[PDB]
Amino acid sequence: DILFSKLVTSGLGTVDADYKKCTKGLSIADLACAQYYNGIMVLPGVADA
């Protein structure tokens, strides 16, 4: 957890999007949902925690 928090959080990096929330429109799309509208789909990490 130190090596996963002490280093810069990848909020602007490759984080998969909650596709179930991106099409609801209940809030303006974040960086993850905005990329989904352009066909870019970041798949879930194979290294499951």
Binding site: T14, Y37, N38, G39, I40, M41, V42, L43, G45, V46, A47
Partner: protein, 49 residues
């Protein structure tokens, strides 16, 4: 010692990225028969492997 073992796989839908969902655009895209198929196959196979 630190060794990288994985990289977040990314897949892109060729039709949505270039045509932005425009119906007339996707008909023109079909002329580039090998363009979308080559890009999508390269990304999908790397993610599966």
């Amino acid at each position: 010692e630190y060794l990288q073992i994985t990289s977040t796989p990314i897949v892109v839908d060729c039709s949505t990225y270039v045509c932005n969902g425009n119906v007339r655009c996707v008909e023109l895209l079909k002329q580039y028969t090998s363009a979308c198929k080559t890009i999508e196959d390269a990304l999908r196979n790397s993610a599966m492997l």
